[PDB]
Design a binder for this molecule. Structure first.
Ligand SMILES: O=C(O)[C@H]1CCCC[C@H]1COc1cccc(C(F)(F)F)c1
Length: 134
């Protein structure tokens, strides 16, 4: 057993707060905000050795990242940013920093009761996205 055991599984979005304002702060344009904001993604998290994979599937886009903790990688986000990402574990929280165009956003993923809670921060703006097991 290991590092991210409690994250592994298939998860479905059950609530979102302040996501439009997060996306605005990130620089996402109107039509992508509207369509992406409707989506109810499924997130599939798996671990194989040191490699963590996070897959997201939705009506809008499917995304997938695979990574080693602490090791920077290139990521294409769902809104089509080309970013440089580093993901670490800090006190049981997955902390994901994305850098692009001199900007930065941080996404935290944590287990809270039977939920997986995702907090997305861009400058002073936070969005909270709650997932439950599928
Ligand atoms: O909810 C989350 O896990 C977060 C993760 C960080 C970025 C924001 C949000 C992902 O937001 C979206 C919104 C629409 C569709 C998709 C995807 F299925 F294409 F991945 C993803």
């Amino acid at each position: 057993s290991h590092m991210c055991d409690a994250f592994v599984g298939t998860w479905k979005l059950v609530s979102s707060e302040n996501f439009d304002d997060y996306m605005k702060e990130v620089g996402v344009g109107f039509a992508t905000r509207k369509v992406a904001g409707m989506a109810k993604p499924n997130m599939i998290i798996s671990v194989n050795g040191d490699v963590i994979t996070i897959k997201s599937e939705s009506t809008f886009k499917n995304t997938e990242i695979s990574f080693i903790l602490g090791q920077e990688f290139d990521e294409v986000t769902a809104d089509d940013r080309k970013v440089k990402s580093t993901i670490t574990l800090d006190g049981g929280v997955l902390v994901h920093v994305q850098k692009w165009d001199g900007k930065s956003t941080t996404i935290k993923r944590k287990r809270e009761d039977d939920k997986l809670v995702v907090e997305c921060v861009m400058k002073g703006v936070t969005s909270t996205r709650v997932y439950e097991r599928a």
